[PDB]
Write a protein that binds this ligand. Structure first.
Ligand SMILES: [Mg+2]
Length: 236
């Protein structure tokens, strides 16, 4: 058939056949918490504030394509509130959004998210990543090979996910640049490192991985399917 076509069938897009046997020569596996071990879109785990505030925040968040923004919009919609007309929308990706509704200035910006109305913090959200099911693939590889979780998220969130999925080595509160330095150090130390990430917020780290995998949500392997199990199946 052809390696390239066989891999597509399994929802992997490969860049070079070399990545193939290179898989066997690697010894370290690194996961990005967000998007790989968890779904690409987080959920609202709690909202504190009144329903008008909720409608205001969702109405502004409805103009962003950020996953946190989508988590907030979905939660508000499940609560039954309707989207309101916003003017003067402004966004700074991943950090905050702003807009005007009913003569009032609303800001939603990085509990995890505060809602301001005319300068005053009046509501907030806790949002969390949702883990992907399938937990045995991990042990299998822990058999055959060291696993590491990296994340720009806070200690307690990262640790807790490490706890659930049963992963020992993990680093938290990392900037993209922290991750890149970690890869280089592993490679300096002699490790052949395969990394799985979102493909953007950690593109430099991937670019340095011995073999890099991007989620479907440049890299050596693109997981169109977002099927990590099948990737870990292959590796294992
Ligand atoms: Mg949600």
């Amino acid at each position: 058939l052809s390696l390239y076509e066989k891999m597509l069938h399994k929802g992997m897009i490969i860049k070079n056949s070399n990545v193939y046997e290179k898989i066997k020569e690697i010894d370290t596996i690194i996961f990005e918490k967000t998007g790989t071990l968890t779904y690409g879109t987080p959920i609202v785990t709690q909202f504190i504030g009144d329903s008008l505030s909720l409608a205001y925040a969702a109405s502004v968040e409805a103009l962003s394509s950020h996953p946190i923004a989508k988590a907030i919009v979905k939660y508000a919609k499940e609560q039954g509130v309707k989207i309101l007309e916003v003017k003067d929308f402004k966004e700074i990706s991943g950090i905050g959004v702003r807009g005007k509704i009913s003569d009032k200035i609303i800001e939603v910006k990085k509990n995890d998210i505060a809602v301001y109305i005319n300068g005053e913090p009046i509501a907030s959200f806790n949002i969390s990543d949702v883990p992907r099911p399938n937990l045995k693939d991990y042990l299998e590889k822990l058999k055959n090979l060291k696993i590491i979780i990296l994340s720009g998220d806070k200690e307690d969130k990262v640790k807790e996910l490490s706890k659930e999925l049963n992963i020992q080595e993990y680093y938290s509160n990392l900037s993209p640049e922290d991750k890149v330095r970690i890869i280089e150090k592993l490679k300096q130390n002699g490790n052949k490192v395969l990394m799985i990430g979102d493909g953007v917020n950690d593109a430099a780290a991937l670019a340095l991985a011995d073999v890099s995998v991007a989620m479907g949500n440049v890299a050596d392997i693109i997981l169109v399917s977002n099927d990590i199990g099948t990737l870990l199946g292959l590796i294992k």
